[PDB]
Design a protein around this nucleic acid. Structure first.
Ligand SMILES: O=P(O)(O)O[C@H]1[C@@H](OP(=O)(O)O)[C@@H](OP(=O)(O)O)[C@@H](OP(=O)(O)O)[C@@H](OP(=O)(O)O)[C@H]1OP(=O)(O)O
Lengths: 46, 442, 272, 223, 852, 101
RNA sequence: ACUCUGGUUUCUCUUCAGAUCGCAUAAAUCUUUCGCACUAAAGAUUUCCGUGGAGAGGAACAACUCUGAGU
């Protein structure tokens, strides 16, 4: 925000630079995946 | 009175070990032996106009650079560099007159205290006990016996063989300026040559320290070869023939057990090794009173304690996934047997020290009743007598290490603290729970 | 497979021109002095705080000031004070301005300044003395020509035909000093998630006059980066088994191709 | 002492016992001559009495010196950690007679030759905290009046013994406030099951004759 | 030998045979300013010499930075000498005893060590940055050291690609650099033959980043290989300078024809380089093959697919081949050890060249007495043993030989400093992998192993049982003086012996490092700057003494100084009242202190020369100048002892009987100082009169020296004294847009910006200042932090200045944590020094006086 | 500041899901002015930071490099620079010409 | 300038990899650390996120441009 929203483009909802948050949540999902997968596999046994 | 040449031989300001020259008036040690050197400046400034070179062993007037010649000063040189004559190194048993120090304290050579620099009690005791043995004391009292040792140039372990010799020579000085010697140099060398183990800050196990020192001395006495016939290896190391075996299995029937008993899976083998120290294990306290034994300290006879090493007495080892039921046998006895009773063990949640007493007669004893039958008559002499005992009194965590040593020359078995020398009755020697004992086979 | 990406110099120049807005336009890494990964690691390990950087819990518990009592080498009445040694002056020379600097990674000394006069107008020639460069003051026992130092008629400079400038010459010399992806000319196609487009902005010093919230956000990002860097245990040697390829080998899976929107809707329905 | 126990590594100061209660400015300062002289005095005292009968350990004891490098002579008598600071070294520091300070004047001149700053010894504060903790824990089924009486007795003893030093030791005042808060919380729990939002001090501090708990507290509980 | 060495173009047996030759060894040091390119140039030399060792694409293969501190800190820490065999331009193969010294101003000690074990210096100048403070300092030191110099220009790639100056402007910048170097040389040179120029063949143009080393002769030979039948020497004699080439006449015209013909150098040398660098770095994909075919180089598809910078390095290495030009220039300028033996013996070797032993050493005959000399003492990998390093001036040191290692003070009269040792197992001077050897012929550099026991700083190994009339090589004289002091103590005093052993080892390791223990028991160790001491601690606490050590705040070694004349006549008497000396103190005439300290006014000369140099330059009276006694604290000291005794009252012979004692006492006093126990500078103590008894038992001996010291202290205290502090010249190189910030930063450190100026050809200016060292701690961090990491600075103790206040001022109070103001500095400095040193806190004018 | 500097010198001598990191946990409060107001990274008057508006970044320049450029450039160089600036302004106007409502 | 083993792409499997295996960055368990641990550090372990090396097999289209080699 504080970088893009400068000059003619002031404060607003038009900031569409989402790669950083996407990367952070992708890393979080990749880390979380083994635990959730193990839980789901344990749930469906026999 | 102020001359103490026990610590490191360095300069006051220069902090260099080359061309040192201690001051015979100012007490401290400086460097140089002439003008524009630290010694001349220290002599001019402090008016201390008498200096002796720690290497040249000559007394010179440093401000005037005129070497002095007075035989009355030979005491300072003797205290700085204690040299034992060829015959004087063998008259240690003829110690009749008490050696009075330059201070106001009569004493006897060998019975001297090593200052307890922090928790140096274990190392000080081990050193004062190992110095009692006439073999090692005589070997270390002659610098020629170790000066020409071919050690690698880039080795630090050679300091242990060199520093221990200086301590042994100082502790046997008949005309020492003081009545005690500081183990600072030897203990510092031991700390440096042990990889942060057995330092002077935190006390260590006496048995472990003795074992490490003996191994270092054996590996340092030999030089540029695998010469196992070291002075330490010849004076305090013997041969034990462990006719050891193993058990097949506790959870197997008769057939499966006999199969391994016959297929050499539970066979008896002779693995004879060199037993430098015989860890005679004391039995655990019963932790229960009885009708007898008005004192609640469980006594134990030495003969029963030492009979475990005999051939008949079998011992079990709880090895991983096996019942190693072994049995030892002393093939050959060393001239000075060293026994270290492991009076401290580790419990399931702590580390307790067994308080059982070792009823060991300190006059005469023979191990021929526990020796190997093969060479029983080969060892002509078997009447061994205890020479020195080191007892670790007190709690395991906070404990004191006292040494009860039987002095030669006289017959009194003096008990020595860190810096206090007392007299102990022979019957009282067998009372304190001993930890490490060294006996002479006579 | 998209494993190698080697483009020509003009292509990389055009890519850098189309992306110079997101690039920090730096030349010498010396502009990040006492603000690099090593500096942050040394600050964290010394229980100090670089003002422009983050701060974490001490690695080793530090005793209080009163734990020592006016030691001969710790007497305040003997130290001459001229300027207070800040945390920067300690994180810069850890071995001289920090007692017991256990596990203190040193930082690289100043690399020579990259004096690269960046181009500003394509019209100007490639190797031209720009006004930014300070002028050189034009103020040799040269032998006389009376001798017979005559060269053969075939002797010529090696690149007489090759010009001293070119259309791509100035642009090519520009790419020498550039962010790493622009600096290289042949690379491997990294993963999309593995290419942070904003890391260099956070790594640099915070912009001047930023609000307290922005400064705190930058400090937190630096803390996260330093934590992910100090814990960079190298990966272990796996057997290289591909779960996706394994499921593909399984007879209970089919293969097709569909738009990401349709696949996302199908995945949402499947999750529901 | 050096002849009978040399320390060429200057390790005598590695173990000298200083008082962590007083600030670093007033403590022994651990000098070169000071530490060695203190160790020498401790040894000479220990070397007099035989160790067989009774020995004064060099660890649990305390030898403090005052000299050119140590301006404050610190002592700990009768559970009152004091620190005498002579006016010869306390110059350029006016005399503000706070409760904690104890102006020790001269004998003949009757002038203030020093100032014996006093403070409750940490052992006494630890004992008081242990007593308060035991009273709170061993309250059990005892009536609130009994707990209040026990707390009042403890506070009366603490304040009457350390009459002056209870003010200088700001740690002691904080401990007293914490103990009073803990006792009030225990009483409130005994009365109200939940946490009472600012229960009035009238319930606690009212005298026994009027029906209150009769709590004697040294806190700043403004009515 | 049964040794093991990395594969090399030459042969180990061939290298040993070449070493056996006495007139083919190049003893050179690659002196150069910080980050000039010296280490990378040695790396290129090694890469050519060692085929296996190659440079990584990104990280340069620093094969001359062995120490971890130099490996990570970036700046070179110590000199890693390398002795390797490399070919020349003609084709003959030499061996080079190179020594890659560091460029940091603080680490000038290693440079000073290198010169005493070398015959010539190869100065390194960065093309983009020109001459720097370290470059000028190294030039001055080398020329003062009386050694050959061969300036070379590196980092030309910066001009060709970063700065992008036109070829004519490039030649202008190079000519300005050479002119500045020559002018700096002539400021201190003596013989006019010491000139440097590409026309004279004492200049090389290199680029370590891409292996673009060449010269006029080598590049003319490149033309010769490309064309053929070209006289390389005569043509290269016309390839440089203002002369222009005329194609019509096929001759080079002194007067420039056609009104558009650039200089010969730009026309032939710069143009092609520009063209090839532009093609490689700007138009590789399009016109790479055509240019390569024109130049003749062929590169495979893999080699031409590299990144721009490694590809440029490969192309330049193919084009220029070996570094023949550098070797040719070194052979031309830097003489052989036999040729340069006489200058070395005359300069550094003591005992005189004309002496019999001096003549034998000057002969440089391996079949002669062994009189080697070890400058630096290197440390083994384990850090336990030390390996002394030096070059044999004569004889042939061999393994297992018994030697007599004369120490740094093993004089002839008092040989007590000698220590007869047995050197053995010595290797050759390789950089990253030493190679063993059986013997060491006279001229090569030998890394002995075993003579390190008495070798503290510098020593000369001699031959026992022979050469009984021998002297010890003169101790090193460093460029600058150490002024920073830092007390260090172990955190746990139990490990003090380990820390002091490590301190002795690190004192041996660093040449200029000074260590001592004061009366307060502090373990003070000196040092040139700040990064110097940081490296000292990073080695002390992690390499030699692995314990943790606590270091106090850095300080500056203050020096005493008298301002006014002696207040009155001080009558000091020796004990027993047999002698009564009297000395009157007076400050020395301005400039005379710096003249004595620069060894210009050498008391070693005879009476006539010293008298003339004192009566003429110093304007001293012809009778006053004829009664000098000594030279204050040291041989080159800022104090002068003058025998001002009136002959009508004092017998000359009787005074001479106490002359030695008086001189020794004066030296001791000037070394000690009466105010803060510090060296007294810029004083002229004159013995006004003296009473001397007859018998030596009553007069002199142990009584005159203490009386002399007391009289000196009383004289230096009676005259109004003043403490002095070191002022370190700082040359901050910053962009002209940031010079204002550089001036602002130096404002808050009591230092004035002496001179600001832009760098000719470079956008970055070079601001020069003089910040006092006392408040200069951390100044580099502030300068590089207030400028956002765009300015770097160095420091060197230029001179000393009087403290703003008065030391003997009892009316000024102090503070434990508040910096004393400007007028309250001298008294605060004196009190804090006397407290840190543990001396008495009061030094009155009647402290050492006779009456009290 | 000054009192803070002296106090710092003396010092050197001797549950709840918080969403937004509070400003209390921030750094860079330096007493010294030299380490608080430091000269920015002016890339020789030809570069600036990333992300920020290029027009805004160039507008807020220090003008120190611009003064040297306008007082050192040659007359022909000045004319070429003026032509380039005119071309850039024309390009901006063309961008401004495409904006309408 | 004559000839010559030598094509790349792509799919799959095995095995090795402490190299910044990756110019990116998570998760979980234990252990030590002060709590009274999203808001916390340290040490270890493990699983994912996906790689590089080599080998083996497979199907598409290049057959010598290329380069190394046999002149
Ligand atoms: O606190 P700031 O960083 O100044 O930002 C706050 C607010 O944050 P808080 O929740 O902490 O008040 C939001 O910004 P975030 O910090 O949450 O991103 C909000 O924007 P959103 O609700 O869209 O997130 C807006 O920030 P901005 O002005 O950048 O849109 C607002 O700013 P102000 O408090 O300055 O009005």
């Amino acid at each position: 925000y504080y970088r893009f929203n400068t000059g003619p483009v002031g404060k607003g909802p038009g900031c569409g630079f989402w790669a950083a948050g996407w990367r952070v949540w992708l890393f979080f999902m990749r880390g979380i995946t083994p635990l959730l997968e193990r839980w789901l596999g344990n749930l469906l046994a026999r | 009175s102020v001359l103490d040449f026990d610590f490191e031989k360095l300069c006051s300001i220069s902090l260099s070990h080359i061309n040192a020259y201690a001051c015979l008036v100012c007490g401290k040690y400086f460097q140089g032996r002439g003008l524009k050197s630290h010694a001349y400046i220290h002599s001019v400034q402090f008016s201390h106009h008498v200096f002796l070179n720690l290497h040249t062993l000559k007394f010179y007037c440093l401000p005037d650079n005129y070497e002095i010649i007075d035989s009355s000063l030979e005491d300072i040189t003797y205290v700085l560099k204690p040299t034992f004559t060829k015959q004087q190194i063998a008259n240690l048993d003829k110690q009749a007159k008490l050696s009075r120090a330059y201070d106001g304290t009569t004493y006897l050579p060998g019975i001297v205290g090593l200052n307890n620099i922090k928790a140096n009690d274990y190392a000080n005791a081990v050193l004062q006990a190992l110095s009692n043995v006439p073999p090692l004391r005589n070997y270390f009292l002659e610098e020629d016996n170790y000066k020409n040792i071919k050690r690698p140039p880039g080795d630090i372990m050679f300091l242990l063989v060199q520093r221990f010799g200086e301590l042994m020579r100082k502790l046997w000085n008949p005309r020492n300026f003081k009545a005690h010697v500081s183990p600072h140099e030897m203990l510092q060398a031991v700390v440096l040559c042990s990889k942060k183990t057995f330092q002077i800050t935190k006390q260590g196990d006496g048995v472990d320290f003795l074992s490490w020192f003996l191994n270092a001395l054996h590996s340092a006495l030999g030089g540029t070869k695998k010469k196992k016939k070291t002075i330490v290896t010849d004076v305090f190391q013997g041969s034990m023939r462990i006719f050891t075996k193993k058990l097949p299995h506790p959870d197997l029937p008769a057939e499966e057990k006999e199969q391994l008993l016959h297929n050499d899976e539970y066979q008896e083998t002779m693995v004879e090794s060199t037993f430098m120290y015989l860890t005679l294990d004391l039995p655990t306290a019963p932790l229960y009173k009885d009708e007898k034994e008005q004192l609640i300290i469980p006594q134990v006879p030495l003969f029963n304690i030492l009979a475990k090493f005999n051939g008949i007495t079998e011992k079990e080892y709880k090895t991983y996934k096996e019942n190693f039921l072994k049995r030892f046998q002393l093939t050959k006895l060393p001239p000075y047997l060293i026994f270290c009773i492991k009076r401290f063990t580790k419990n399931n949640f702590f580390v307790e020290k067994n308080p059982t007493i070792v009823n060991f007669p300190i006059t005469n004893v023979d191990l021929r009743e526990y020796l190997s039958e093969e060479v029983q008559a080969v060892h002509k002499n078997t009447t061994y007598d205890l020479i020195a005992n080191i007892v670790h009194d007190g709690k395991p965590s906070e404990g004191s290490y006292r040494i009860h040593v039987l002095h030669h020359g006289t017959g009194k078995w003096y008990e020595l603290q860190d810096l206090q020398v007392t007299d102990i009755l022979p019957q009282m020697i067998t009372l304190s729970e001993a930890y490490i004992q060294i006996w002479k086979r006579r | 497979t998209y494993q190698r990406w080697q483009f020509t110099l003009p292509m990389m120049s055009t890519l850098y021109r189309l992306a110079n807005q997101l690039l920090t336009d730096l030349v010498d890494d010396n502009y990040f002095y006492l603000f690099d990964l090593k500096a942050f690691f040394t600050s964290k390990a010394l229980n100090m705080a670089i003002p422009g950087g983050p701060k974490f819990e001490p690695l080793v518990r530090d005793i209080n000031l009163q734990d020592e009592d006016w030691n001969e080498f710790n007497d305040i009445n003997k130290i001459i004070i001229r300027q207070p040694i800040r945390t920067e002056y300690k994180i810069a020379f850890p071995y001289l301005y920090n007692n017991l600097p256990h596990h203190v990674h040193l930082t690289w000394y100043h690399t020579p300044n990259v004096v690269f006069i960046k181009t500003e107008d394509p019209d100007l020639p490639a190797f031209y003395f720009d006004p930014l460069i300070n002028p050189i003051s034009h103020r040799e026992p040269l032998p006389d020509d009376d001798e017979e130092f005559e060269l053969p008629e075939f002797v010529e400079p090696f690149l007489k035909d090759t010009p001293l400038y070119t259309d791509n010459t100035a642009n090519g010399i520009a790419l020498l000093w550039a962010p790493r992806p622009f600096n290289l000319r042949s690379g491997r196609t990294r993963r999309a998630l593995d290419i942070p487009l904003v890391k260099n902005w956070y790594r640099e010093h915070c912009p001047a006059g930023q609000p307290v919230k922005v400064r705190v956000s930058y400090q937190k990002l630096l803390k996260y980066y330093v934590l992910n860097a100090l814990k960079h245990r190298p990966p272990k040697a796996q057997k290289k088994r591909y779960l996706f390829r394994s499921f593909k080998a399984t007879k209970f899976f089919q293969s097709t191709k569909l738009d990401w929107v349709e696949v996302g809707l199908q995945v949402c329905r499947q999750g529901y | 002492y050096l002849t009978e126990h040399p320390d060429p590594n200057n390790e005598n100061i590695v173990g000298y016992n200083n008082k962590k209660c007083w600030p670093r400015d007033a403590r022994m300062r651990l000098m070169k001559h000071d530490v060695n002289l203190g160790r020498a005095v401790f040894w000479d005292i220990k070397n007099r009495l035989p160790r067989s009968v009774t020995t004064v350990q060099w660890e649990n004891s305390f030898v403090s010196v005052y000299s050119k490098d140590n301006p404050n002579l610190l002592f700990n008598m009768c559970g009152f950690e004091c620190r005498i600071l002579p006016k010869c070294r306390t110059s350029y520091e006016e005399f503000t007679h706070k409760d904690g300070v104890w102006n020790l004047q001269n004998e003949v001149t009757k002038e203030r030759t020093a100032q014996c700053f006093l403070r409750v010894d940490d052992e006494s504060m630890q004992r008081f905290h242990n007593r308060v903790r035991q009273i709170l824990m061993a309250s059990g089924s005892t009536t609130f009046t009994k707990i209040v009486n026990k707390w009042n007795t403890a506070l009366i003893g603490l304040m009457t013994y350390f009459r002056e030093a209870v003010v200088n030791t700001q740690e002691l005042l904080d401990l007293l406030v914490k103990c009073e808060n803990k006792i009030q919380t225990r009483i409130k729990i005994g009365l109200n099951s939940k946490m009472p939002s600012r229960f009035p001090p009238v319930v606690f501090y009212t005298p026994k004759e009027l029906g209150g708990l009769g709590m004697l507290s040294m806190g700043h509980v403004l009515i | 030998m049964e040794q093991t060495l990395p594969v090399t173009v030459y042969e180990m047996d061939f290298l040993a045979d070449l070493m056996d030759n006495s007139e083919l060894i190049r003893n050179v040091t690659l002196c150069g300013h910080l980050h000039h390119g010296k280490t990378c140039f040695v790396d290129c030399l090694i890469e050519q010499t060692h085929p296996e060792i190659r440079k990584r694409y990104d990280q340069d293969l620093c094969y001359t930075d062995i120490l971890f501190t130099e490996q990570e800190r970036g700046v070179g820490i110590k000199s890693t000498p390398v002795t390797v065999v490399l070919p020349d331009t003609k084709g003959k193969s030499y061996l080079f005893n190179i020594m890659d010294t560091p460029g940091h101003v603080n680490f000038s000690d290693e440079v000073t060590a290198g010169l005493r074990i070398s015959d010539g210096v190869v100065l390194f100048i960065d093309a983009a940055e020109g001459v720097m403070l370290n470059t000028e300092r190294l030039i001055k030191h080398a020329v003062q050291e009386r050694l050959a110099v061969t300036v070379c220009i590196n980092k030309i790639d910066r001009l060709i690609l970063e700065l992008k100056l036109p070829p004519t402007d490039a030649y202008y910048k190079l000519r300005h650099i050479v002119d500045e170097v020559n002018g700096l040389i002539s400021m201190y040179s003596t013989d006019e033959n010491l000139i440097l120029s590409p026309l004279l063949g004492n200049v090389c143009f290199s680029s370590s980043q891409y292996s673009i080393c060449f010269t006029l002769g080598s590049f003319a030979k490149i033309y010769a290989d490309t064309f053929g039948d070209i006289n390389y020497q005569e043509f290269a004699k016309r390839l440089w300078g203002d002369i222009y080439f005329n194609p019509k006449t096929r001759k080079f015209t002194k007067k420039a024809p056609t009104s558009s013909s650039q200089r010969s150098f730009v026309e032939f040398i710069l143009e092609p380089l520009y063209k090839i660098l532009a093609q490689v770095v700007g138009d590789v994909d399009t016109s790479l093959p055509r240019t390569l075919d024109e130049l003749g180089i062929h590169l495979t598809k893999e080699e031409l697919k590299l990144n721009i910078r490694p590809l440029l390095r490969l192309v330049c290495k193919k084009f220029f081949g070996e570094f023949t030009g550098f070797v040719d220039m070194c052979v031309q300028h830097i003489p052989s050890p036999k040729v340069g033996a006489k200058p070395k013996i005359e300069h550094t070797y003591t005992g005189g060249v004309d002496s019999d032993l001096g003549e034998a050493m000057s002969d440089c005959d391996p079949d002669g007495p062994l009189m080697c000399h070890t400058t630096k003492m290197y440390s083994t990998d384990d850090g336990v043993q030390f390996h002394a390093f030096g070059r044999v001036l004569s004889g042939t040191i061999h393994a297992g030989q018994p030697v007599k290692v004369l120490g740094e003070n093993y004089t002839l009269e008092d040989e007590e400093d000698s220590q007869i040792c047995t050197v053995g197992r010595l290797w050759i001077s390789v950089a990253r992998y030493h190679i063993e050897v059986n013997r060491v012929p006279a001229g090569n550099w030998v890394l002995i192993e075993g003579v390190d026991q008495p070798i503290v700083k510098t020593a000369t190994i001699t031959e026992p049982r022979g050469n009984e009339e021998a002297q010890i090589f003169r101790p090193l004289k460093f460029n600058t003086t150490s002024v920073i002091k830092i007390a260090v103590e172990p955190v746990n005093p139990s490990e003090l012996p380990k820390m002091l052993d490590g301190l002795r080892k690190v004192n041996k390791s660093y040449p200029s490092l000074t260590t001592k223990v004061e009366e307060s028991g502090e373990h003070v160790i000196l040092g040139t700057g700040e990064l110097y001491l940081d490296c000292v601690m990073h080695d002390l606490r992690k390499m030699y003494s692995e314990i943790d050590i606590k270091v106090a705040d850095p300080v500056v070694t203050f020096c005493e100084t008298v301002v006014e004349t002696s207040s009155l006549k001080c009558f000091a008497e020796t004990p027993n009242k047999k002698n009564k000396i009297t000395m009157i103190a007076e400050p020395l005439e301005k400039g005379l202190a710096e003249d004595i300290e620069n060894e210009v006014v050498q008391i070693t000369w005879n009476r006539k020369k010293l008298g003339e140099f004192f009566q003429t330059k110093y304007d001293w009276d012809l009778l006053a100048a004829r009664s000098i006694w000594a030279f204050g604290p040291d041989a080159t000291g800022p104090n002068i002892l003058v025998d001002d005794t009136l002959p009508s009252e004092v017998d000359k012979a009787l005074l001479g009987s106490v002359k030695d004692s008086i001189v020794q006492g004066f030296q001791w006093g000037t070394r000690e100082g009466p105010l803060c126990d510090e060296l007294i500078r810029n004083v002229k103590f004159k013995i006004l009169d003296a009473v001397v008894a007859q018998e030596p038992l009553h007069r002199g001996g142990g009584q005159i020296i203490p009386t002399a010291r007391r009289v000196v202290y009383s004289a230096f205290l009676m005259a109004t004294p003043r403490l002095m502090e070191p002022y370190y010249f700082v040359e901050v190189q910053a962009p002209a847009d940031c010079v204002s910030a550089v001036y602002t930063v130096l404002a808050r450190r009591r230092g004035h910006v002496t001179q600001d100026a832009p760098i000719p050809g470079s956008p970055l200016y070079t601001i020069k200042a003089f910040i006092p060292a006392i408040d200069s701690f951390g100044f580099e961090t502030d300068l590089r932090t207030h400028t956002q990491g765009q300015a770097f600075s160095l420091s060197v103790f230029h001179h000393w200045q009087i403290v703003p206040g008065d030391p003997l001022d009892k009316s000024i109070v102090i503070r434990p944590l508040e910096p004393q103001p400007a007028p309250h500095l001298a008294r605060e400095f004196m009190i804090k020094t006397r407290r840190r040193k543990g001396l008495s806190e009061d030094v009155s004018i009647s402290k050492f006086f006779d009456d009290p | 500041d000054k009192s803070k500097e002296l106090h710092a010198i003396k010092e050197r001598y001797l549950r709840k899901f918080v969403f937004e990191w509070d400003a209390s946990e921030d750094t860079s409060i330096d007493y010294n002015p030299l380490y608080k107001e430091r000269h920015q990274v002016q890339l020789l008057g030809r570069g600036f930071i990333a992300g920020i508006d290029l027009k805004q970044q160039k507008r807020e320049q220090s003008r120190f490099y611009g003064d040297l450029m306008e007082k050192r450039r040659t007359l022909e160089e000045k004319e070429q620079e003026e032509a380039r600036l005119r071309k850039l302004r024309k390009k901006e106007a063309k961008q401004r010409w495409d904006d309408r409502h």
